[PDB]
Ligand binder design. Structure first.
Ligand SMILES: C[C@@H]1C[C@H]2[C@@H]3CCC4=CC(=O)C=C[C@]4(C)[C@@]3(F)[C@@H](O)C[C@]2(C)[C@@]1(O)C(=O)CO
Lengths: 11, 249
């Protein structure tokens, strides 16, 4: 789930 | 030091514009493709919103992921219900300020039944005259309302977070009515609304799974929505999801 994982780590 | 509700108020994402071009005419395929493309962007917003919820980041990162995938539709239908309630007292679906479906516009054969389903959510907001703060607390509770049967990896943090927002829902009730000793009826009515969201959303989830899988309808989904749905499809079909209900039905 590449995109969901990205959004949860971002920032 | 200001209140958790005031924080909830601040971190609420602004309504997105769809950019739907009404100069080309309405079709079932076009409308649904547009709604999904919008929903993808709304879910992105929702991830950023959840990350700002005090407590949420204490959860294990698989749990954060799971809750978001399990509840995204009810999150989105609830906000849709709210926007439609404020915009037109539930007479219209306000997907976006440039994408408003009125009675006349829902008359498309394949759209009609899904609109009736979304319309009942907002009619609950009308029937109960939900206040903004009540809506905000309920919405976080929705994020925390659907779980795997095998449970979560940080179950105890999860239980503590649920308690926090249940109390917070209590404070919303107080701000609205004052210190009435019938605030207990209201709490009751509001948890019953939350419970009824599983049923109301189930119909929307069926449409969504159906249109995602039966691609002969040509309905487009953005990558954000595709990732979640294709991940959730086999779980819901394997009957492996547990809805949390406040009252045994
Ligand atoms: C009936 C279902 C339920 C619909 C969703 C209901 C909630 C919602 C509210 C919005 O403000 C924007 C998009 C969404 C998130 C949505 F409207 C679209 O995604 C299209 C959707 C999945 C649906 O219409 C389809 O399956 C069409 O393919």
């Amino acid at each position: 789930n590449a995109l969901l994982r990205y959004l949860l780590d971002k920032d | 030091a200001p209140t958790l509700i005031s924080l909830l108020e601040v971190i609420e994402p602004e309504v997105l514009y769809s950019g739907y071009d009404s100069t080309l005419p309405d079709t079932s395929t076009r409308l649904m493709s547009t709604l999904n493309r919008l929903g993808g962007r709304q879910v992105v917003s929702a991830v950023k919103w959840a990350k700002a919820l005090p407590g949420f980041r204490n959860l294990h990162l698989d749990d954060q992921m799971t809750l978001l995938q399990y509840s995204w539709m009810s999150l989105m239908a609830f906000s849709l219900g709210w926007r439609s309630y404020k915009q037109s007292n539930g007479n219209m679906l306000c997907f976006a300020p440039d994408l408003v479906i009125n009675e006349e516009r829902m008359q498309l054969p394949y759209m009609y039944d899904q609109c009736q389903q979304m319309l009942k959510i907002s009619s609950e907001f009308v029937r109960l005259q939900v206040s903004y703060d009540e809506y905000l607390c309920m919405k976080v509770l929705l994020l925390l309302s659907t779980v795997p049967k095998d449970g979560l990896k940080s179950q105890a943090v999860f239980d503590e977070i649920r308690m926090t927002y249940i109390k917070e829902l209590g404070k919303a009730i107080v701000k609205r009515e004052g210190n009435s000793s019938q605030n207990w009826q209201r709490f009751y009515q509001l948890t019953k609304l939350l419970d009824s969201m599983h049923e109301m959303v189930g119909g929307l989830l069926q449409f969504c799974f159906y249109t995602f899988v039966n691609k002969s309808l040509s309905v487009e989904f953005p990558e954000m929505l595709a990732e979640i749905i294709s991940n959730q499809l086999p779980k819901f079909k394997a009957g492996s999801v547990k809805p949390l209900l406040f009252h045994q039905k």
